[PDB]
Amino acid sequence: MYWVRRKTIGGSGLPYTENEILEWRKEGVKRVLVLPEDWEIEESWGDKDYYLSILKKNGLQPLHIPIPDGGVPSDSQFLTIMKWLLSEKEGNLVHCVGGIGRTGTILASYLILTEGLEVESAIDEVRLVRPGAVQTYEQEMFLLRVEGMRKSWLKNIYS
């Protein structure tokens, strides 16, 4: 896993065992935003709810917001994601299967909203800690929209 902002928000791929989840706790992770679809989670954990119960049994509070591979959250999911990430500043981990596309998109989105970064700066910052972050054109287009609608998202996040 990698931190984009030390101990406040980082990313990772899907853990294969419970020992990798304890590695997250040791690194300072406290809450986990789970982005893969059920079938992706199930390739490693057999059942999506069992995987979430494992996170829960390990002191991590999980939130599952499935995004298809290569895709982006719907506006509705994005609001939920940002309300969740902004609810507690420390120890946020966001993950998908490999730690790069969906995850880098959400991390860069977070930076755009919280630091007012332009889209190219946000993408660069995440790529510096996670090469290849933000994989598809749909993802890149989404981030430019996040920048363009920054004030409207913040207004809707805090109503």
Return the SS3 of 154: helix
Nearest C-alpha neighbor of 32 from the set 98, 109, 94, 102: 94
Task: Report the alpha-carbon distance of residue 12 to residue 24 in Å, rounded.
Answer: 9
Resolution of the determined structure in angstroms stands at 1.9
Place of tokens 């499935």: 66
DSSP track, 59-108: T-EEEE----TT----HHHHHHHHHHHHH--SSEEEE-SSSSHHHHHHHH
Q: Is domain 1-159 classified as CATH 3.90.190.10?
A: yes
Structure tokens, 38: 């059920």
Task: Report the alpha-carbon distance of residue 40 to residue 64 in Å, rounded.
Answer: 12
Method of determination? X-ray
**In the chain, what are the helix, strand and coil shares in percent, each to the nearest 5?**
55, 15, 35
Residues 13-47: b if buried by 16+ CB within 10 A, e if exposed: ebbeeeeebeebeeebbebbbbbbbeebbeeebee
**Dihedral Cα 115, 119, 124, 127, nearest 10 deg:** 100
Find the distance separating the first CA and the last CA of the chain, reported in whole Å: 33
Task: Report the alpha-carbon distance of residue 141 to residue 12 in Å, rounded.
Answer: 23
96 included as an active-site residue: yes
Catalytic one of 9, 81, 96, 117: 96
| Cα–Cα distances in angstroms (integers) from residue 143 to residues 61, 94, 104, in the given order | 26, 17, 10
| Cα–Cα distances in angstroms (integers) from residue 120 to residues 34, 116, 127, 149, in the given order | 25, 12, 10, 15
Place of tokens 């982005």: 35
Q: Using alpha carbons only, what angle is made at residue 153 by residues 152 and 156, rounded to the nearest 5 degrees?
A: 85
